[PDB]
Write a protein that binds this DNA or RNA. Structure first.
Lengths: 113, 107, 80, 120
RNA sequence: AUGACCCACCAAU
RNA sequence: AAACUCCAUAUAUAUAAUUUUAAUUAUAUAUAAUUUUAUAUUAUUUAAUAUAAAGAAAGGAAUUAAGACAAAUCAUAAUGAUCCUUAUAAUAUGGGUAAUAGACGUGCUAUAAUAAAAUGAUAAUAAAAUUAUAUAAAAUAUAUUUAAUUAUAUUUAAUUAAUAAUAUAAAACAUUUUAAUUUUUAAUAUAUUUUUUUAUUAUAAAUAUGAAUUAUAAUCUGAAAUUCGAUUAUAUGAAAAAAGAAUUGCUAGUAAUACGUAAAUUAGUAUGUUACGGUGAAUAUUCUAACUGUUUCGCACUAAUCACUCAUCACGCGUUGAA
């Protein structure tokens, strides 16, 4: 059926296979984050019995990779680059310079000070 | 320094510097290398004392105290009495200038 | 998950059925404290390309499946 | 200062750490209160030790585990996993980063000491 | 583009 | 090029009800200097060197032209041409990028007294920066007996920022120590050095430096530290005696600093990157050498001296001589 296990809309603007993978994880984890938090609280509350806790720790290990944010890497929304990615503009060491110098980024120019 | 010999320490130090710092020297300019000539070089005030102070710190690393701050004073007191091997140092230098006086760039 | 609490690592495993015949269960996961509960069987461990067959020992306890399954091969020599 | 526990020490040498030095089974905190139980005024040197006192000193070290006696315990802990399938055992036996450090370059240290009976 | 090569340093009027 | 520009500096105006309090500030603006005035030597109609006198007067940054190196990038992106579409395209799990004989470059930490470590609660003293993909204060428990410090855990106060948090800046300063060092002590007495003196007996090259390193336990983050992270406690304590030929940065708030500080990238780790401030220098222009612009002379070179060019020898192959 859909390439990704669960059908997902496509990220507006620049689209990349690595971006699609990251975007897929973002969409899935966003919804699963609540469950991720629920079950982890379960496993970590000593105030409980070991078994209920274990059952949970285990399910987590079983939860699919997309159910994680550690797996989501900051990637330039415009150039699909995951290296030197400033998060203030969600860009990169180049698209920034480019956008900032060109003036695409308002109030962002050169540190002449 | 003052204590071991009760007279103005700064003045005594200045005198010691004046005594020790040679008034001139001899740099070794290249001039198409070959046989580089040795011509006496005049040494500025801060230039003169700089050499004198070294001959002293170098002589303060031969003392005993585990505090250079004051191994300096004793050397300084020693110099006052007239005991800093440096004097000879000066003498040789000057001598190496007496000769090599001829090479003087201009009168 | 290395701590007195949160001890230790539960990696879902066919140990149950394995505990019957003992079939070396291809536990490709290779990332779990050797379970101190069943502590005893035989299985192969994916060393990147091949799963090395090993069983359980009187040393293999906290030691994680991977610690027994070497990946990179040994170094060699210069040019001659 | 004398033949205390065989390999003794020297005078002027405050005992507290002196023990941490010569002795291998004891060091730092262990040596510190080791004097505390024997109650010797701190900052006290070896020369001042009243021989009879050393006697207590000796017994004290016998009580806990000192000398290469423990060298072996680790030697065995090493041989342990080593004897099992243990990356370490390879790293340790081959003389290579047992702490997974810079095998590629800075590894001479490992090669120098890391070995079956490491602590040599 | 044709296009695998480069070789010598000695001291003054 | 310079100049305008930005930071920064002097003053001046406006704003802040002086509880966002730092009014010693923060900005918005305006002026200011690429300093000027005067005399005296020199020179030749008026420049330089000294002197004074008026002002606060002083820096950094950004901007690096044309061209060339067919310099770097087809992995920021994008695109031509060419090559694959059941695989050179997409996904999951594990592995790898962390492998190590040797070699190089760059750092860090080092080798102890013109230097290192505890300690300093009327908290000596800062700027810059962060905090709705959060910082996380007081305490509270443990490591540990007091307490402090240090590291984790419990609960989240306040603050989404001139408000509260990271965060009491640290170095300097003071006192205490400190191997070798027999320069020590510790038992005596000795006494107008008392934290000290002196007489006597004793006190047999890696240390209390160095933390590479090795075990065990413990803690963070996250499903998950095993190849492979971080932290601490108890242990371990190699190498290292200022480092050959050789070579690197820096000319003033710069270098140096065992001076700390912050941010970005982090679920998580900086010996790196980018910024901030504290303390704060010597040395100098006179030689060669190298790179550049201005010029001389020469020039057989011109993808230009990393040019170009010459003869022998050695290889293979023509023609034409002697005999």
């Amino acid at each position: 059926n859909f390439r990704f296990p669960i059908k997902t809309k496509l990220p507006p603007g620049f689209i990349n296979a690595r971006i699609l993978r990251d975007n897929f994880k973002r969409q899935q984890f966003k919804e699963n984050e609540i469950l991720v938090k629920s079950l982890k609280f379960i496993a970590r509350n000593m105030n409980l019995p070991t078994k209920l806790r274990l059952e949970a720790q285990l399910k987590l290990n079983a939860l699919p990779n997309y159910m994680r944010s550690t797996q989501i890497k900051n990637r330039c929304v415009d150039s699909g680059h995951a290296r030197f990615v400033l998060s203030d503009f969600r860009l990169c060491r180049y698209q920034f310079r480019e956008n900032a110098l060109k003036g695409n980024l308002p109030g962002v120019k050169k540190g002449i000070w | 320094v003052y204590c071991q010999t009760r007279q103005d320490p700064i003045q005594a130090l200045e005198k010691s510097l004046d005594e020790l710092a040679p008034l001139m020297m001899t740099k070794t300019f290249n001039t198409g290398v070959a046989k580089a000539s040795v011509i006496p070089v005049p040494l500025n005030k801060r230039q003169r004392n700089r050499i004198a102070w070294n001959w002293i710190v170098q002589s303060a690393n031969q003392r005993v105290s585990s505090d250079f701050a004051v191994r300096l004073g004793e050397e300084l007191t020693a110099i006052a009495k007239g005991t800093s091997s440096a004097f000879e140092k000066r003498d040789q230098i000057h001598k190496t200038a007496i000769a090599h006086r001829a090479y003087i760039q201009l009168k | 998950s290395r701590s007195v609490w949160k001890g230790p690592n539960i990696v879902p495993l066919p140990i149950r059925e394995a505990m019957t015949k003992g079939t070396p269960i291809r536990t490709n996961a290779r990332a779990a404290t050797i379970l101190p509960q069943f502590v005893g069987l035989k299985f192969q461990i994916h060393n990147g390309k091949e799963y090395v067959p090993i069983e359980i020992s009187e040393d293999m306890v906290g030691h994680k499946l991977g610690e027994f399954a070497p990946t990179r091969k040994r170094f060699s020599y210069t040019q001659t | 200062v004398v033949h205390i526990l065989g390999k003794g020490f020297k005078g002027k040498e405050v005992i507290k750490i002196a023990l941490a030095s010569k002795f291998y089974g004891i060091g730092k905190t262990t040596a510190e209160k080791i004097c505390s139980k024997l109650g010797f005024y701190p900052w006290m040197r070896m020369h001042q030790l009243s021989e009879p006192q050393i006697m207590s000193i000796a017994s004290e070290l016998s009580t806990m585990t000192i000398e290469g006696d423990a060298r072996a315990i680790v030697k065995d802990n090493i041989a342990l996993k080593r004897k099992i399938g243990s990356y370490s055992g390879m790293r340790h036996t081959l003389h290579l980063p047992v702490r997974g450090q810079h095998t590629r370059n800075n590894a001479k240290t490992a090669r120098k000491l890391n070995k079956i009976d490491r602590r040599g």
